[PDB]
Amino acid sequence: EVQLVQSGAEVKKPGESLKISCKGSGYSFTSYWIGWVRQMPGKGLEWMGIIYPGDSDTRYSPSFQGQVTISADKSISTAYLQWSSLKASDTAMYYCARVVADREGFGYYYGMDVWGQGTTVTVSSASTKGPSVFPLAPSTAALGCLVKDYFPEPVTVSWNSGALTSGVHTFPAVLQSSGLYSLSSVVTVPSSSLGTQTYICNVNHKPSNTKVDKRVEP
């Protein structure tokens, strides 16, 4: 299979250096150009530049020139993106993609057909912190959990150890001014089932090895 496989999520503080990777499998990696695309949280796609790994011929966007370094280790079918000093604005999803071109050196191009799964880069002054889980007590009836002040993303939120799926709404997190994240997991249930059914939110935050099973009663 023709694949592009990127490195795992990165959480860094401003000023720190970072080298994210992208490995090609199932095709001659030194016969294609590979492109780097940035996608900022909630935004569109931005072309950063291309590397031809066969000779490390690089081409940047004027917006990324002098901001990042694109490189390749052709021996291991791998391309890299490197920052000598990360900024908070570097927080985003980063994709690598294969540029289809002719193998004859005729200068024919056919878009980016094979993309990596992406690597999430988070740059913040904040250190790892577990969520503080609070109940959104019911008053049909709605109830939930406020998963407050955690870093970094993500938290996972289930209900009744996975039993309660119907009408369960887990909202995207919001970055507070404090630099710590907050989200809500809500569940609309019928007002009659309140007194007899147990409502527990299962919050997990792998980064701080925080596990919370909070009960939501009226």
């Binding site: 191009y109 878009g111 980016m112 057909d113 049909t140 909202f171 919001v174």
Partner: protein, 215 residues
Amino acid sequence: EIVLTQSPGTLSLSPGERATLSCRASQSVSSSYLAWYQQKPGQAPRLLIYGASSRATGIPDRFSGSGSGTDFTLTISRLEPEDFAVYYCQQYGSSPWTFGQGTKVEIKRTVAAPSVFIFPPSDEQLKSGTASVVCLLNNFYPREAKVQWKVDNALQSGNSQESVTEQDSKDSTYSLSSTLTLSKADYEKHKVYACEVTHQGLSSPVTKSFNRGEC
């Protein structure tokens, strides 16, 4: 550089209907080198059309592309449930290679008003020094909804954050969560906590309030 403008920003259509997405370049795209990509939330982009008119390997027949030099169109003759996503156009005939800003193709349904619920800060939170008041707008269409917070009938600003779910697989509605954060001191300084919701489905703005301490 070649700027690409996609129109509309949001295209609201029904499954089975035809989608027609515009991409216009600020100058002629060299060798008609325009690609179209689909991006679904969470996923990585997927190449649909290359060279303005050529359908990518593995792409279904319903996806076609047209366009001369400055104007380019992506057509989806019949929308399938999986066809509802964001669509980016890209030029690669002149450096720098650029992208358009995306067109969200979402499912059009009839207008549905939100069911609004207000959650006071929990006792356990109040102990920490901060109070969070949560207003939830449930199962509404369209995505457009304005949530104002009023603390002792005073119109709040800069102390709330908003969050929206992705269109529901079943009823094609949206849900929204709004959090008004305040210090433990300012929470105990007021009585009325009201979240005012404005939507097309609502004939008049709905207000869900409570009195601090009072059940």
